[model samples]
Target chain A: NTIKILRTVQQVRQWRAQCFLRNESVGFVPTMGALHAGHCSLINQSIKENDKTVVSIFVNPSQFAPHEDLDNYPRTLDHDLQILQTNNNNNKIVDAVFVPKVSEMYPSGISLDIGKQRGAFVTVHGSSEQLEGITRPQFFRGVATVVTKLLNIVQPTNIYFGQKDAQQCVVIQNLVKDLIINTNVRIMPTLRESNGLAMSSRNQYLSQEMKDKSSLIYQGLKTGENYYLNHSGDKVSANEILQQIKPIISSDPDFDIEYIAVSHPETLEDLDYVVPGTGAIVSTAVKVPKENSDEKARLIDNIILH
Target chain B: NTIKILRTVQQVRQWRAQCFLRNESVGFVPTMGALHAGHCSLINQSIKENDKTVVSIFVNPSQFAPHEDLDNYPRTLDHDLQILQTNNNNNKIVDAVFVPKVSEMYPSGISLDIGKQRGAFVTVHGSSEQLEGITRPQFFRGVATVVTKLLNIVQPTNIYFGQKDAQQCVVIQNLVKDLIINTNVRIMPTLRESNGLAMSSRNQYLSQEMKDKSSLIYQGLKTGENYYLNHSGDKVSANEILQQIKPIISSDPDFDIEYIAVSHPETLEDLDYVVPGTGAIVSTAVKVPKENSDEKARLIDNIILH
Candidate 1:
């Protein structure tokens, strides 16, 4: 009863105006639906701090490559509203939700093919070039464009993002600062299950056995964190950080390892040696065995060691 | 008495917030600091329409190629303030002038080379790739990025742009809409000289004798407009439009001709055959003789036949 659903761009604008008129601080959370505990945690943080909270659920078409899972990606609009409803059940914390159509977002129309795409696209070149960007070349561009649109439309005092996607947080920070958008960005900690596997919508595709094994990725990151913590001084080479994570993942032969990266926090470039006392980002991704014939999931995990 | 000079991003933000609280509509005009009758026309129009007016005088370094006029581009801040003061002198309509430094705009730092560029950039691929973009490949991207940053920082209700740059007008329109920025875009007619050359900051690079002859480019576009208008019921070919402009430009030998493009309004792609009743853009660029041994001014002109 508390959350007002915004389906059009104008509706969101009008709602933002109300927040301004009342001198209320707004907290915005942008998502692609299929809300899990991770998304809920972001919402809870927003609700706790701001006078109003607005969440957006958009499955952007431009971000998905032709071969990627745009069609088969998660779409649980019903369960999403239910999760928001439960948030309101605790207290009327969630004030509004924006779910715009493709026509509304892309007034100039869109193309899954980046070459054929028309209109404005946001890009963060250096910060988005390595790690996730190497595998998914068009990925950050898609996120940047959609996120810019959302931030402009919502105009929140503070915006929320989960720290699970480390590279994304940096991309968004660069985006918001570079554009000089009038909003504060807050990145919440990644919510994980008891076994230490990161909670994601795609985790539903995995069987219990595969899910247990997938927790090994985060454990490896934990091991890297421990090595960095115990290294005492700045003796940990980037390879040495990788040295700890390699044995754990290789222990399970079925684990399809992509990369164990120790990259600079800002540039996302691999560090030659971790800085003294100050740490670097240790992140990894693995190809989770396909549960369904149509679905492919590459689960990623990261830890920022100090 | 009413003009407040703003030199930082935060000052502009605080100023925008004041206008918001007062329910005042702002008219933003982004410029590169060379004040002329062309800029005054935009400012006067903004003054006549909105409650407050903002003009940014930032000579963006990223827009200029290493070979282009970054060093020599006119910096007439004193003259610009004088013009804005005149607007304020009469009725006090000009509220603030944002003159941000290079460091303030690019907090993440910048490089002139596109390949070596770090941080965020806004790009309009299909629209920006043609016309001026071909010769100056990084031109529109620089404009789009700076303009997006200015728009976000300014947060104006109505933004003003001149029709002198037909492709830039369309590019800005696409940038604002594609990003869902809550601002109205109004394109004013281009101001022309008595001899017919479009008003621009680069016009200073040419001597009076060259400026008089450079007006021939506009005269050619005028020829294109007349030809399009004469072909009333729809038999005009793209080549037919070019033929009209070709004879006029060829009459003068000093004129170095680039491609005379007849393009779709939105796509900026060359039109094979123009549609009936509906018009298209006919634009050209000609290299004017060097005046200072350093500055090479390519005079550009366009006409939208409606």
Candidate 2:
């Protein structure tokens, strides 16, 4: 039998209480409904590392401004569950899934009471000021509050997240540590495409032609990485390498580049300069052509901090 | 069976879920310990009105300013439970008791990251600026946050609060309605002493001599009430009556009055003088004599709608 699905925070909390009574440690993965290989990795890791696993899927409205695509967030529940239940290259299944309603996701509704207004959300001011942070100001606070509510409900022993959203990982980690919520947050590495591009649900929006050009986003990042590796001790030159990648992004006519930068990989804040010892990642998001259609699409991708 | 005592938020939430599963409507009474007849009235009302009753005893620190009486707030748990267990006066034995720790009361400590911090911790401008609002600035925020936390944890059908802490009841009622936290908060009338003094836990601190003199505090409030009643619908005259009580209070050498005013019985904001037909209260705290064994002593008292 595959894992059972609970579609309410209350139900999952009940499940967690039972596990607590049985002395089982619960692991968690908080997600926005559409699932992919990146999310599966987090679930698989939870299964391997914890006695029980709970995955909460809620497309948080507070995280997305009205101008953003909250309503259009990919939500393929049947397929998402199938991915968790069925194995791909190897046989593996997750423990459980928790999918709550929009109302349940925010019982009190999106509250600016928490500075997370529906049109604007929370952000990590110190670290998330670069890249996507410049665009989605309250993104991290929205992420933090919802994750916290879910964490309170699940009371997980360990929670897993993908490093693909590197700044997000750091924000959550810093939140967990600073707030001392008692849950162990583990961020796994970003899963990449065979072509070195990071895997993302947004990639589905990319047309074949745009997809081909999209590889350069990763390629430019790779060049910056090589540059940073060679001049390990010099940050200014590494930053200069970042300036070189901007032209490569501008060269792509099929995509509208939102942001491109290299910085402290964990914090996601732009570095004073690239120092060999400091962790860094090249992260960017772009509006791409919808696959097999004329619809406009948004895509996000990242390159690892070398 | 007598109520089980819970010392953690986790424990309370677990029981609340079980009650929910059973479809039992729970009633809640949250307190800061120092239980008295007034508190018992709330407990009694909860028991009379709902199927099950849950009472929480938590002296929250977040609401107390840096030098407020948080450390000195009475926390007589052992005596408190005994009082509840053998309640002959009200016969309102609680179904459960939540005694959450300081950490449990504030899981995130104090964080503006989530924008959950307000008043004493992290505040927005012009949000809190009125009467008791400006006086004990963090008071309502701490009360509102903790009350919201308790409401979520209890999931009560009906919540009971005594009218003794008039402003507190008003603020909580406003918070519940404003936040839409899904609980019915019922405010009962102030349970008072035969001498007309408002019952308070701090009353224990008064010496025999001070207690005799402190009866004048209640007498002044009575004058305020009598004045408002005689004036009927004349707001201007009712305020004049409220002002008349101060001279009586000042005549007593034992009392150093903080404030004596007519306020909206519901909102607790000071009225423009006083308005007849609008419910009002005469409330004050006085520096009473410290006993030979004491370092400091103050008495808080209030009288009903003028």
Candidate 3:
């Protein structure tokens, strides 16, 4: 419970300098305040890998669309801190937690609509025009911009992200490669529940029934994963892979399938057919209608198949 | 006579780490390697101010258009390093020169056109839509991208620029402020020739007679500067400021006026009228013909007036 919490850029920078002076290697995990096992897994991996670990909790407004849940997005600082404190592996507590105010992070002010915003924004051009981009158009743009600011502020030796955000992982990797940002971006496996639903903060928005039904998404991915594991030849077509998952997802009356894609892991370009020995990512998004809420909750999950 | 020439990002980062370990201050000057007195002025000012000075000699191809002179852009690396070695005020010679190749700066391939280009790009949206951006739309995008990479690599305490690039100075200032890129962005006064023409690497492209006619640019700006000084009240309008320079540029048969405007010093937005004690930048661009080349060598100059 004695974790150092820094509220200002100046404070975090000074702390980073001290860490640098002591020759400590830092691993950074950036997140919104609603911490889950997925986020904790990223933090634990960072802690295990580096001499120091830093977790930043700031709900980035720009990443959400104006019509989406920017206002209703989860915020539980105290509970998030408790979760982080309790989830440490082998007595490795977080070295620092940067909890910057919106004004501190974006001095020029930020808006969900980028048109109204002014200042420098980082864009990962062609990389952002695919996958989740088709649905949440400006999502990756916001992610790219915010992560750039954080990377500059933290300057950590390594940064961690979960495989649940497949497109985001690709975007961040491209960002680091293109900008030559001096940090290693490491993507970890997606953490899942016993029922096999991908761990996400947005999962809290779902009703218990909707949450239970969301397991079908991972079950569908699991079905595809098994097919990929069992098949050794290039005979598997993308449609065949889709057919295996379609039955599991379509069986649920409450679930509306958005997209099921088998694509190149790095580029996320859709693959029509699988080539022998080539790795591909099987990713999907589904909408789960809540009983009380008019708007459906969206969930995404991905599995890499070689 | 021996200058430290760093050819790769890893090499410069290693050198920078040594500077970090010793806690020595670094001043940076980024140039496109056709080093002129203007560049030397930036370098000399940096050397005078900081313990160590770094000059980057990369002729950023991204800043040029495909139809423009990217292939023909002046590249004088050997002469550039020698000039840095010689232009020491108070015996502060250049510490290191970051001479990264094109591939090194942009590990992921880069193109002259913005549309075809992929990867991380820094954009100062609203700021880059005026003045120079009007003629060279993607020029600032390239400038912004390359400068961000350079700033990250150099990690200087202070970064020096020339006021000759008035709009670029404003864009970079906004970038540093908005992104919180931890370096002091210093703008030195524009260095001019004895004939009053502003110094640029492209000056080599102009003939002696055309260069002589180019002083008309400064003469016109000086006229506007005098008018701004003489007219103490709000009587002088932006239109009046434009009228002052119109005749000087128009008088020469060889000089073709592009644009002459009085704009806000920081925003570069065209001003209708000046309020008392409010300063405005008088900026202009012109084209002069060469003997063999049909395309004229462009010249630009500006002066801030209160």
Candidate 4:
């Protein structure tokens, strides 16, 4: 059994005790139950490294600002469990799959102010504001707080994340390392589709055309990578680089350009040139439609140029 | 041999893993070193309830006010070991001890202005201006933040606390219960001397007469307790009750009353009437002699009208 889903602190303790008995290091992969390949990459990494693995699916409301997509954030719990069960293969490796209720995750009883319950969403405060920052000012904060809560509750020795959210990986890394949360944060590579679109649950919301153009963001990121690698030590103006890729996505009317720019990987601020050791995170959020046409979805993706 | 003192997170994890191998549930007792029977009470309780007990002693500077006694909070590593060793031999419940340094306790440093660090400290935030509260306003803020850090580092199944410092015990209970730090707080009763003086490392600062008179504070608390308990719901007013106790200590030339208070246990706020289930905390602090005077040291005691 995949260590029966623990909702209360008591259950988590019981599962933890068993894990302690086996002398296994607990690895954690916290998600919002929209199990896509990106999440799988995180699970796979956790499975490989840790003796026991726990996956949490909580679409934290606090991280989603009032205007943002908390309501629309996908909740595929049944599908997620099936995916985890099949992936874990008799629960030998993945000792547990933590599927806590949204109500359980938010102890605030009533969602009077969702932001209040969101514990320190471990981010390097003020980094995600311009490009990805403009699209989701509160996104990293939400990510940081909920991830921290999951880390605290699960008490994992190692935590796995996906590089699909490149800036997010950096943010999580900074959070764990800076706040000294103790869990070894492992950033797995972005698992992408054959078409070059990075794996994401939001892809379900994309029309075929939008999904095709989604790869263009990655392609643009590749362009930035190639430009940086070739230019080497040359100082490339951030505006000029954004101008270079502006034409690629601007033609697509549905693709509302969030920001096409470069910045320091550590600080998450605007920078004119990419540093040697520190890389650049190229990211964007496109306005897309759900299967139900009226339900608008914002599709996000990012790639890091190291 | 006792488990070697751990200075960093890696060491804690290694110890946790070692304990896990033995089918043990790690019961954590976090403390700032300066062992007294009150602290021993917590360790003793952990021994009774847990398979493995972990005691952490770190003087958390984050919780101390700028001019407060962080520098002077005693550290008796040798004596502390003797106490734990004795406790283990007496109970026959051998486990482990984790002594972490201030550096590891607060990596980026535990700042009192937790808001600046993207962290929030649970604050009672009321009138601590009464007796003990009057001495240190920043005290509780520091308590909340450092306890949060300690909980993170130890990852104890259950945290043991002592009720000798009634306000602190209540504060820790409230902080753990109300906030997101994942620890179940277990408050052990106040461990006191035969003379009724609550055990404190600071008690060493007292003269023979001051130590003798120290019991007066507890005596006064008992007077209030008898008055409040016997008077039915008739309720003795806080001011009138403290007035009766004040002269007993104030009449002595050596007595300098820090605070004589009656407050709700959880909120740490003044209470008008001592209700049935709602008890009052009577505490006072006196300055220790700077050089040679038989100056009364800051002594603390509380009576829980059960």
Tens digit of per-residue lDDT, candidate 1, span A129-217: 78888878888999999999999899898999998999999899988888888999898889998889999886666678777878888
lDDT accuracy of residue A158 in candidate 2? 94
Q: Give the per-residue lDDT of model 3 (tens digit) for B107-132.
A: 77888876788788998877788888
State which candidate has the highest TM-score: 1
Q: Given candidate 4, what's the lDDT at residue B252?
A: 58
Q: Score the docking of each candidate (DockQ).
A: 0.80, 0.08, 0.70, 0.19
Q: Could you say which candidate leads in DockQ? A: 1
Task: Write candidate 3's Cα lDDT for A80-124 as tens digits.
Answer: 888877875447679899999989878778877767887789988
What value of lDDT does candidate 1 attain over all alpha carbons?
0.85
Please, what are the lDDT tens digits per residue for candidate 4 over residues A147-222?
7667766778888887767677777776675455667888887888767887877666667766676677667656
Which pairs of residues collide in model 1?
none
Chain B alone vs. reference chain B, TM-score for every model: 0.92, 0.83, 0.92, 0.83
lDDT of 2 by residue, A220-299 (tens): 66666666667645554545777767777677787788777666755555665766566566777777566557776666
TM-score of 4: 0.77
The residue-level lDDT of candidate 1 at A279 comes to: 71
Which CAPRI tier for candidate 3? medium
Instruction: Give per-model CA RMSD.
Output: 3.0, 8.9, 3.1, 5.2
Tens-place lDDT per residue, model 4, B114-144, is 4554322334334233445556776775676
**Each model's total of backbone clashes:** 0, 5, 0, 9
lDDT of each: 0.85, 0.67, 0.84, 0.66
Error of 4 at B110 (Å): 5.6
The per-residue C-alpha lDDT of model 4 at residue A252 equals: 60
